[PDB]
């Protein structure tokens, strides 16, 4: 998959510094376009970053801060768009990269040619050379009056001169292959971009970063939209009009807008709108419904929208950081929550600022009916009287449209829970899972983490948990009645996939049909007690169904 959602985490410290380099690699591996921000923060000096060699396009900004790596291999990145900016002013931010000595040594951005919107921020880098020898105006867009240069030139080492074979002195490295390709300040006439000085070498008006010819199907990047190799200005409409009567007829060439490309259908986790936009949230007077196949769709409604529940970051909870006792009553009977759910340390104990009562462990029973979360789940505190997360038994799917820190969709931190708690969690739509620094945490490696993910960019990061050798040597090892050794925790319950038969929520063996007081009928390996008040039998099947007609008498 070449479309990977980026991270949303500024200079803020990581959750688990040990499993951080394993978080960047499990997210930008085999990716070419980043639908978000590219943030490279808090990397050790000897970290290997070979997985960042294929990044080409970034929708958001580029953040490179607090790193001791000598080289960042982002040599094949052409265009950064800048839909959202760092401090609302910058599109490229290289800060605080310093301690043979460690720290960033060279920028190594050889193909950067177009920044549509934003600025560049380079401050406090002692080991960085060649940072002020680049004509940054060329890389900035023609329609960008926000292009402000803030470059710090405080260096702790002596730099080398650029390669003499380079025409001028604009180089990103000392080697001969580190020159800069001037594109905009060398054009002849009113050409926004040109591959050379000749007017015939001018690029098409839809070329973003450059061109390999005069045509409109060979731009290095598409300025507005990418129509399967055709740099267009708009995606083809989803409907055609009679233009006299103006009637609606479906267009077989209808494409949907998804970032900077035209797509036949919206991606798996996204939503398709009648206007022709791949959304994560339906617009006003629209509604999210499931089609016959099972895909997600934003569909209109004449009647007012049904009352839905909202979580953190959503309509009236856009600024709440954790679930307190003030908003705990809102999630009453909500079979679906539009938004996230966070439990910070300040949730189960009252806040001195206000008269906030602390979260009693019996108040968390309102979540015993929740079945779907469209955002992340973040539990960094949990009562010690509750051994697991058994309040989320009915939680089936966490879609992860909104990700905590921009990467994680299921995070547990310092809980001290017993095994896992999460019984029926069967799907993580997007974002990684991070279960770390829980001392009494067993049952981590025995979860079908591949049967819950939905894309190759999802993974499981875990560290500083209970050692596995101590977990097995206690009699807690996925009781064998669970099929294929996939268990959620100790007991006849917590089996991910049953092997023989079910009796309610617990994994059981051959039913009590022939030797039980309630006579049962096995429907897809499910013991179900039915009262045989027609004919007491002693080893024969009494009832075929729950109705009176199916009874023996």
């Amino acid at each position: 998959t070449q479309v990977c959602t980026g991270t949303d985490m500024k200079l803020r410290l990581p959750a688990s510094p040990e499993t951080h380099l394993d978080m960047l690699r499990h997210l930008y591996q085999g990716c070419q376009v980043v639908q978000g921000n590219l943030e490279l923060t808090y990397l050790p000096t000897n970290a290997s970053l070979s997985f960042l060699q294929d990044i080409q396009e970034v929708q958001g900004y580029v953040l490179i801060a607090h790193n001791q790596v000598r080289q960042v291999p982002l040599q094949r990145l052409r265009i950064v768009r800048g839909t959202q900016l760092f401090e609302d002013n910058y599109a490229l931010a290289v800060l605080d990269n310093g301690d043979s000595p460690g720290g960033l040594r060279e920028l190594q951005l050889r193909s950067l040619t177009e920044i549509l919107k934003g600025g560049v921020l380079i401050q406090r880098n002692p080991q960085l050379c060649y940072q002020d020898t680049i004509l940054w105006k060329d890389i900035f867009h023609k329609n960008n009056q926000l292009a402000l240069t803030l470059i710090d030139t405080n260096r702790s080492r002596a730099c080398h001169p650029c390669s003499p074979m380079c025409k001028g002195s604009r180089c990103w490295g000392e080697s001969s292959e580190d020159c800069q390709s001037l594109t905009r300040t060398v054009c002849a006439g009113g050409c926004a971009r040109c591959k050379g000085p000749l007017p015939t070498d001018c690029c098409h008006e839809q070329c973003a970063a450059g061109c390999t010819g005069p045509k409109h199907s060979d731009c290095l990047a598409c300025l507005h939209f990418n129509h399967s190799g055709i740099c267009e200005l708009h995606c083809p409409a989803l409907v055609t009009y009679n233009t006299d009567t103006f009637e609606s007829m479906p267009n077989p060439e209808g494409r949907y807008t998804f970032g900077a490309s035209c797509v036949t259908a919206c991606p798996y986790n996204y939503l398709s709108t009648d206007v022709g936009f791949c959304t994560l949230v339906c617009p006003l007077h629209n509604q999210e419904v499931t089609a016959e196949d099972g895909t997600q769709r934003c569909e209109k409604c004449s009647k007012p929208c049904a009352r839905v529940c909202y979580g953190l970051g959503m309509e009236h909870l856009r600024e709440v950081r954790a679930v307190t006792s003030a908003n705990i009553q809102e999630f009453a009977g909500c079979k679906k929550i539009f938004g996230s759910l966070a439990f910070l340390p300040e949730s189960f104990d009252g806040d001195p600022a206000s008269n906030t009562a602390p979260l009693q462990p019996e108040q968390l029973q309102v979540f015993e009916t929740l079945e779907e979360i469209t955002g992340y789940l973040y539990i960094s505190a949990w009562p010690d009287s509750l051994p697991d997360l058994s309040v989320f038994q009915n939680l089936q799917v966490i879609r992860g449209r909104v990700l905590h820190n921009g990467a994680y969709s299921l995070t547990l931190q310092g809980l001290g829970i017993s095994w896992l708690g999460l019984r029926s969690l069967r799907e993580l739509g997007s974002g990684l899972a991070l279960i770390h620094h829980n001392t009494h945490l067993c049952f981590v490696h025995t979860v079908p983490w591949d049967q819950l993910f939905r894309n190759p960019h999802q993974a499981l990061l875990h560290t500083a948990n209970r050692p596995e050798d101590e977990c097995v040597g206690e009699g807690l090892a996925c009781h064998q009645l669970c099929a294929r050794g996939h268990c959620w925790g100790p007991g006849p319950t917590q089996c991910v996939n049953c092997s023989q038969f079910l009796r309610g929520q617990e994994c059981v063996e051959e039913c009590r049909v022939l030797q039980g007081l309630p006579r049962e009928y096995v429907n897809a390996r499910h013991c179900l007690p039915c009262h045989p008040e027609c004919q007491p039998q002693n080893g024969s099947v009494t009832c075929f169904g729950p109705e009176a007609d199916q009874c023996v008498a």
Partner: antibody, heavy 119, light 108 residues
Framework: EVQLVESGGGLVQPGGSLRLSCAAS????????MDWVRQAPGKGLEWVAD????????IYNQRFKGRFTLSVDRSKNTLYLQMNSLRAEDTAVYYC????????????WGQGTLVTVSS | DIQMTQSPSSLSASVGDRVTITCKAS??????VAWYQQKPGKAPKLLIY???YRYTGVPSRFSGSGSGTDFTLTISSLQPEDFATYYC?????????FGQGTKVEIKR
């Protein structure tokens, strides 16, 4: 908060051309259908046209098709309305509303820039 | 084209009375009818959609009704803020045409 500001209003001779703009903010631009409405001085309201931000497919009125020309610039959340061959009936205030779902009713109108034509 | 006609074109009422405004179309626009409000000099604001549902952020002293060709906008209690012009509109079929306006003003 959603707020829309129009511009381009002024005074031109009959037959002259103008181009009204309507910048949007506070909401996702490429998610709603954008519109232009006009009201003659001391008269009622008259829907003018209809534009789509993603495809660009514009829906005009039969009395205005051929003279007016809509456009969309998603790079700066701006609408464009090119008026050509203005007659003496084109003196009014030009609102700039938006669709909720692509059924033609409005909730968040603009400010109502004024266009007047006279010799 | 559909002619969207209100009746009456002008009305006077005191604060606290009951105001009834009727709009009528020349074609079947059963539930494709909205309502608006324009004070002198400021831009219009949505009040009713689908002829029976209020918009978010609108007081409860508004109740549209009527289906087919007859429609009605009613205010249960008047306040010294809703003295303005009330328009009706149809979006059921192209073209989409507003009404001529109904002016509601204080009585003495």
């Amino acid at each position: 908060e959603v707020q829309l500001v129009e511009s381009g209003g002024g005074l031109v001779q009959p037959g002259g051309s103008l181009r009204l703009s309507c910048a949007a903010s506070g909401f996702t631009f490429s998610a709603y259908t954008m519109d232009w409405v006009r009201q003659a001085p001391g008269k009622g309201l008259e829907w003018v046209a209809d534009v789509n931000p993603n495809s660009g497919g514009s829906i005009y009125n039969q009395r205005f098709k051929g003279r007016f020309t809509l456009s969309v610039d998603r790079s700066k959340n701006t609408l464009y309305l090119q008026m050509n061959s203005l007659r003496a009936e084109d003196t009014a205030v030009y609102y700039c509303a938006r669709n909720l779902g692509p059924s033609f009713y409005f909730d968040y109108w603009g400010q109502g820039t004024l266009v007047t034509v006279s010799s | 084209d559909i002619q969207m006609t209100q009746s009456p074109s002008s009305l006077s009422a005191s604060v606290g009375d009951r105001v009834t405004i009727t709009c009528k179309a020349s074609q079947d626009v059963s539930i494709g009818v909205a309502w608006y409000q324009q004070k002198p000099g400021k831009a219009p604001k949505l009040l009713i959609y689908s002829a029976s549902y209020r918009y978010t952020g609108v007081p409860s002293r508004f109740s549209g009704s009527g289906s087919g060709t007859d429609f009605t906008l009613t205010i249960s209690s008047l306040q010294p803020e809703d003295f303005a012009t009330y328009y009706c509109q149809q979006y059921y079929i192209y073209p989409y045409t507003f009404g001529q306006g109904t002016k509601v003003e204080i009585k003495r």
